[PDB]
Design a protein around this ligand. Structure first.
Ligand SMILES: NC(=O)C1=CN([C@@H]2O[C@H](COP(=O)(O)OP(=O)(O)OC[C@H]3O[C@@H](n4cnc5c(N)ncnc54)[C@H](OP(=O)(O)O)[C@@H]3O)[C@@H](O)[C@H]2O)C=CC1
Ligand SMILES: CCc1nc(N)nc(N)c1C#CCc1cc(OC)cc(-c2ccc(C(=O)O)cc2)c1
Ligand code: NA
Length: 159
């Protein structure tokens, strides 16, 4: 099972200027409960964006995709291809834009957090992949963040 997990503005934006363009602590907790104890796969830019205090993300096997054959990072398994990245029976792809697109055809689950923030797309933004008719989803009830954004959870699957 390969799953994709991301948080996106309604607009589809997941990243800008190398950052996630909002704060949503509740989403982190959700992310942790999905990924804990599993292999996670991420592109090199997403690895770089992890705060040093949690690079690698603890309790998870950190797998980092890079085309740099000699790229190394403490606590991460650097691999040069997706095939090398997806060998664990349960694998969660945690970003970013490039790697979601790369892994999408291999995926049968998506766990999405929608953030109700006004954030029109800008050129060069990292974006969420588009889920077509092959996917079924269940939409969670809107929740209200400690800071004030409304957000909700989607679970998508295809068999
Ligand atoms: N909202 C969310 O849920 C998330 C948001 N983000 C945001 O996403 C943005 C970064 O995403 P993005 O910019 O798309 O970059 P990625 O995080 O997808 O990493 C891209 C890198 O992955 C490597 N790579 C890509 N394709 C391949 C391949 N086919 N084979 C081998 N290596 C490959 C390259 O590394 P090299 O260049 O070293 O070869 C490339 O530069 C940031 O803004 C981040 O904050 C990140 C994660 C989740
Ligand atoms: C939490 C953000 C997030 N939400 C959802 N739904 N899906 C994702 N794939 C990511 C992601 C990501 C990259 C990232 C960036 C970051 O700051 C740049 C922090 C984390 C992060 C840090 C700590 C923990 C943890 O303590 O478990 C988890 C994620 C993770
Ligand atoms: Na829900």
């Amino acid at each position: 099972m390969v799953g994709l997990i991301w948080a996106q503005a309604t607009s589809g934006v997941i990243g800008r200027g190398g950052d996630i363009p909002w704060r949503l602590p509740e989403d982190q907790a959700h992310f942790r409960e999905i990924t804990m104890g599993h292999t996670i796969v991420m592109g090199r830019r997403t690895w770089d964006s992890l705060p040093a205090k949690v690079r690698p993300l603890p309790g998870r096997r950190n797998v980092v995709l890079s085309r740099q054959a000699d790229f190394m990072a403490s606590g991460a398994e650097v691999v040069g291809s997706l095939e090398e990245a997806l060998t664990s029976p349960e694998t969660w792809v945690i970003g970013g834009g490039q790697v979601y697109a790369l892994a999408l055809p291999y995926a049968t689950r998506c766990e999405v957090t929608e953030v109700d923030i006004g954030l029109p797309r800008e050129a060069g933004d990292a974006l969420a992949p588009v889920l077509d008719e092959t996917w079924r989803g269940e939409t969670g009830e809107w929740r209200f963040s400690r800071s004030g954004l409304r957000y909700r959870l989607y679970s998508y699957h295809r068999s």
